[PDB]
């Protein structure tokens, strides 16, 4: 696993930060803060070593640090590191990856 600002997730947990919420549309219309829901786009900042799927070997997670991922709607854990918000998911709860 890879630690991020002195925090290492355990087993098959992935620490991500969500992308910034959209403040203004493409036209130029300023959006309000209450109406902006939770951003399901995230970047991976920390990964765990993995769980054990079979006998005698570790099974690593399927995302790397810096990967752009699509979060699910429910299933994140609040982590506050250096007064900055972060969310902890399981490796299997991540819907997909924005490969480039």
């Amino acid at each position: 696993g890879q630690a991020f600002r002195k925090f290492l997730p355990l087993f098959d947990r992935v620490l991500v930060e969500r992308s910034a919420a959209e403040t203004v549309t493409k036209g130029g219309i300023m959006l309000p803060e209450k109406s902006q829901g939770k951003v399901l786009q995230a970047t991976v900042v920390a990964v765990g070593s993995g769980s054990k799927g079979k006998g005698g070997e570790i099974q690593p997670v399927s995302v790397k640090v810096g990967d752009k991922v699509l979060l699910p709607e429910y299933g994140g854990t609040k982590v506050v590191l250096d007064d900055k918000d972060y969310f902890l998911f399981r490796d299997g709860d991540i819907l997909g990856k924005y490969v480039d």
């Binding site: 549309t25 493409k26 036209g27 130029g28 219309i29 959006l31 109406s35």
Partner: peptide
């Protein structure tokens, strides 16, 4: 809702 009012405002702002 947000989606019911934004495109009219975009037309008015453009």
């Amino acid at each position: 809702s947000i989606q019911s009012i934004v495109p009219a405002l975009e037309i008015a702002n453009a």
